[PDB]
């Protein structure tokens, strides 16, 4: 980031001394039209940055749903079938594996470490077999439910109550998948990314005729404004991906595991 | 790149502007940058709001197609958990659900669904479906039959029937949504007026920029016009989300992803 | 397009501006561009927000009308799947559902339903409907008794009676949605302040632009007029979306579509 | 219209500016338009956003009332379809539903409900309802009694008791909605700060404009002041949409339509 | 708070008035035109960023709305479905009310053991406190009262679910506030805009001084107030659960919820 700040000082220091030689040549740059170009570029940046934040908000929200759906899915099992702790333990395995599996999915990293830690090596094979493991896990979770229904422990009515929670989970898998694959640029945020770049360097060549030796000091401030806002938006265009923060996605998979363990009394120590 | 016509009609409107600056004061015409800043800022505000509407629309498209994937996934899944016996009923419903996705992509693209419909369904059904003045919506009706019969046959209760019915509702809203998108363009008025005044402005600009820049006019009267046109194209770039080229939604891609996800779920 | 009345009343105002510029420094009226530059930008900002708030009402109007097709489509579908036999009820229900679309088009346009209502229904009904304070609400109450009877008859169970009820809810939300949009104008004075102010700014702008551009004034003032004036009517056409203008919602097309859809092959299904 | 009380202050501020312009160098006060351009623009951006946030509150108000009408009609229609016999329950319920609408109107407007409540309810109820510090919550609670009775009568199944329960939910959210809107004002800073800045900016402006415009200052300076002052009172009017102003919500109108609607549905 | 900032700006104006004498004899110009540009840009960005903070504050205030609505109707469902079972009434209302109070605490990073022991037996208070999310646990315990009523045939699976859903709704509120709290907006939306509005505000006098001479301090302090007000109006609404006076009144909100849930269950506050 700081690289484009200092190509500017160079461009200013150039524009100061090279301001001499088009004295005789008749090619001038006022500030009046660059101020127009700038006020424009800043409107578009403000609108664009706005869409990026909205993209980030949807990711935060989607993940919060994982926590809620999983918490209330486990709560329904305890409230409805308070005895079936072998089932409780199994379903809580699948939910926790889904969180971890999804975080690994959006990050394009390996899930095998977290999966074997959580599920039997038949299942870990069936899940790593599938092209859609996160979906696969939800399918397996759904079996432990539908089985308690064959077994008669769940009625169609109380089966339905829990199924709606696997729905909430399924909309999240799709929800994040769509956020991740979709480039909100369509590589067209590479247009704005560069138009800001051009304007930001042509700026001293228009500012120098007003500010003399001040040109670098003011031409970098305007640049650090315009470049921050752009890169701060390009960041939130990809909120799971490589250009993102992992502390929340990891603290989130950790909280849900902690919450699900505490909810089935595997914590505290006996 | 119908854009790169007025990008270089500009350089030619910058040179008509340079060599005919001389005559200006004698004709009594002056072009100052001050009102073109006013105009351009008012255009740029309007362009900004208008792009926003267009992006919201593209998003809404990407979203609806996203829901086909969710609703059909969970619908297969519900069928597995609730009737794990009935793989006859599984492969039937899965083929309608796959057919729906493909029949919708065609309809939105105005292409012929008969190929895929026959790959996926018995000729009886392909006939039934294509008879309809609304075949995608019909495919849904046929999928709901397999569900309904299963209920008639006692295998689904009213409750579990309801659980799967709501998945056909989600799909039924995806159809209405795409139909509405493919037929309600952002009023031709919004797109015609803006596209007009952005053009008129971008070509009167070098006449007003010349007093301040002398020969520097093209290298800047273009850089300004690219910014105001790139932004008006990018809005027309996303007003056809169901097209078959460039930035338009990869409906063919998505349709496969659906078919693969859905066979993966049923061991095929 | 009474816009072109004033697009030219402005040319006659640019003209008054030019044949009074050479009594200027005599009458002592210094008049510059930079405060009208402020006035323009302030108006554009408020025109930008106002026009966006209009498109939203239009968008919402369009969406509600979409919901009619969806709710009515799957309402038919549920009858064809749950009571596939009862085609005498199928037709009774479809008849009402299409009365709804036409009736609501009339309600929102303030035209006489009686034509359409008779084309579609028995006359004992056409009277009872036209008898009612809210007719569209009454059509909806008749569609309910159709469902309600089938439930009493025992053909529909409580569950599957409920499944269809929700769809009449979906439609009662579309009713109130369009009343709210129609009977609620954009709060008053929003139009008077924002429409008074843009005319006035359009006809004073040449008086202060003439000093800078000289003759170019009618060209540049009419340009700025077409920009600020088309945008103010564009926002006004959208305020009323159930209107009869060409930019309004095509409600007769939409009701036809609904009708062709619910009678795909004369209400006949696979 | 204390805007016109404010607008004339500006025109006397303008004559003041004109007469006291000459002694400017004699005092050393240079005032250009350019920094007021920056400032005034910034005010417009903030006003734009601020005003926008208000129209939201107003719209949300409107929609909550919109749902009262929807929720109460379908609650009535569900009774006329599930229990077309039991008219004793229809009267008791429609009376309770229409009481709710009126109890809420009076609640939001801070007015005595006892007129409309007595007019629609028995006296053992009206005393116990006004007894409550939450009378509209109480009406809803009594409205659920009738439903729950019918279910314990066996005239409603749990399933059809369910279907109607969900409209009481719908109405219970409308309560909370309006209650939240009325108590929660937009942070008492958005309307306070911006009214200061607009007011003060309007006053100083002719002192920056007069150097340029001279005797013209009153005209240009009172125009610019009108634009800003008007766009600022719009957002003030919407701050409380449940008031009595001509530009607030017609709640008396709204509540009669609800009472005619539910009465025409019951043949009364 | 920002009243020192205004003052420091005056000093910077006064510094700039005295220091204008050495200007071109030190090699500098400063036009107003470039700062109108940068200044407008900052206003646009502040305009959007402010808009995002109002949204968080609206949603915080909104989620707390749903706490009341959900609990009021979970109570109404009990009364109307099981009017007899008034022991279930009191016990459920005690967890629902304790849920509110613990959520207030959770958000505020303060200790609920007081409010908890007021409301619930100690077997519960210890059980609740052992949890890494006591509000979750409280929901679990209010879930059993509903659940055991279903095992005793007093609630069918249908009417159980009716009330279960309100429990689900509350769980959404909980996850929602937890999400509004643990996620601040990208912290860059502060260091960027706070630096930039500050830096712009203390150099504006240096550039206005040519145009306005002595007039520089007033105009410069007006423009600085307008930018600095609109800046911090977004900082307040960034922790809407905090204890600042503009933050949400969670204690009043929490009482209205108790008052509401008692007024429904015969007992009088
Ligand atoms: Cl366990
Ligand atoms: Cl357990
Ligand atoms: Cl199969
Ligand atoms: Cl009656
Ligand atoms: Cl609720
Ligand atoms: Cl009746
Ligand atoms: Zn949920
Ligand atoms: Zn357990
Ligand atoms: Zn733990
Ligand atoms: Zn779903
Ligand atoms: Zn199978
Ligand atoms: Zn295309
Ligand atoms: Zn639907
Ligand atoms: Zn039929
Ligand atoms: Zn409803
Ligand atoms: Zn001239
Ligand atoms: Zn002339
Ligand atoms: Zn009746
Ligand atoms: Zn009687
Ligand atoms: Zn009284
Ligand atoms: Zn609720
Ligand atoms: Zn009780």
Author numbering:
A (entry chain E): 24 to 293
B (entry chain A), D (entry chain D): 22 to 289
C (entry chain B): 22 to 291
E (entry chain C): 23 to 291
Sentences from the study reporting this entry:
Human bestrophin1 (hBest1) is a Ca2+-activated Cl− channel essential for Cl− transport in retinal pigment epithelium (RPE). Although the structure of hBest1 is still unsolved, two Best1 homolog structures, one from bacteria Klebsiella pneumoniae (KpBest) and the other from chicken (cBest1), have been previously reported. Overall, the channel is a pentameric assembly with a single ion-conducting pathway, which varies in diameter along its length and is constrained at two narrow points: a “neck” contributed by three residues (I62/I66/F70 in KpBest and I76/F80/F84 in hBest1/cBest1) on a transmembrane helix, and an “aperture” formed by a single residue (I180 in KpBest1, I205 in hBest1, and V205 in cBest1) on a cytosolic helix. Here, by electrophysiological and structural analyses, we show that the neck and aperture in hBest1 are both indispensable Ca2+-dependent gates, and their dysregulated opening by rationally designed or patient-derived mutations causes Ca2+-independent leak and elevates Ca2+-dependent channel activity.
Alanine substitution mutants for each of the 12 residues were generated in KpBest and hBest1 and subjected to crystallography and patch clamp, respectively. Moreover, the equivalent KpBest mutants (W16A, G18A, S19A, L259A, P262A, G264A, and D269A) all showed an overall similar structure to that of WT KpBest. The corresponding “Ca2+-binding” sites in WT KpBest are occupied by Zn2+, an essential component in the crystallization buffer. Moreover, KpBest L259A, P262A, G264A, and D269A all have relatively low resolution and slightly altered structures in this region, suggesting that the binding of Zn2+ stabilizes the channel structure.
